Amino acid sequence: KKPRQKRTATKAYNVTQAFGRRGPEQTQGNFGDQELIRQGTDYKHWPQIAQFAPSASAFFGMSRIGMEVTPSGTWLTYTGAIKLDDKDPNFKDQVILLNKHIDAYKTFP
Amino acid sequence: KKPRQKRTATKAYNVTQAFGRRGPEQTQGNFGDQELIRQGTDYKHWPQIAQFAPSASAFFGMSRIGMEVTPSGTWLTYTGAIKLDDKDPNFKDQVILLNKHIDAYKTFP
């Protein structure tokens, strides 16, 4: 189907199916509690997470972009940081929501 | 206008105006030669670059997401990698196009 970076997780094709298991390794995603993992973009608070994701123009404009070649193939690398607005009246709710998903897999039964 | 991560660069609002000057530091973008800097999404080969940009779902599914509280504010950190298809006949040209823009800023004021 679609290249991995263009996939959209849903209830029918979830975060694990599209992007693999959450874990600690540099190759793994770490974001998502059990609800977000099974629902993807169907998750009730998805829009509040998607407001932090970069447009294509911002992805290539804000990030440090590189190319790394490994035994698995050729990779476009990306790093960066998005500053939350502490004058956003939703700031405190945004922190709480991001805190619920970052490394949430560590607590899974 | 838009938050930084949702901005769209164009000739009318360019990569420097939207995302700041290219540079070597951690929250400095390093991507784009003078033509892409000037034109943003009006760049003639923008679709060949944007094919590698992640969906919101993939950005939060693939990336390693962190939160840092520093003297400057609260930051959402992100790292990851997007696999190129080395079997795509277009692979060689994709690599040339990306490398044209990665760290181009080092060659001009």
Numbering used by the authors:
A (entry chain AAA), B (entry chain CCC): 256 to 364
Provide the authors' original text about this structure.
The nucleocapsid (N) protein plays critical roles in coronavirus genome transcription and packaging, representing a key target for the development of novel antivirals, and for which structural information on ligand binding is scarce. The NTD is implicated in the binding and melting of regulatory elements required for transcription initiation, whereas the CTD drives protein dimerization and is thought to contribute to the binding of the RNA packaging signal (PS) sequence during virus particle assembly.
Six molecules organized as three dimers were found in the asymmetric unit of the CTD. Each protomer in the structures is comprised of five α-helices, two 310 (η) helices and two antiparallel β-strands. The CTD dimer is stabilized by extensive hydrogen bonds connecting the β2 strands (Leu331–Ile337) and the interaction of residues from the loop between α-helices 1–2 (Arg277, Gly278, Glu280, Gln283 and Asn285). β-strand 1 and α-helix 4 (Gly316, Arg319 and Ile320) also play an essential role in stabilizing the dimer. The CTD structure in its apo form shows an electrostatic potential distribution that is conserved amongst all N proteins from the Coronaviridae family, with a major positively charged groove located on one side of the dimer surface. This region—which is flanked by Lys256 and Lys257 from both protomers in a CTD dimer and further composed by Lys259, Lys261 and Arg262—is thought to contribute to RNA binding. We observed that this positively charged groove extends towards the CA-binding pocket through Arg259, Arg276, Arg277 and Arg293. When the apo and complexed structures were superposed, we observed no significant changes in the overall structures, as judged by the Cα RMSD (0.19 Å deviation).
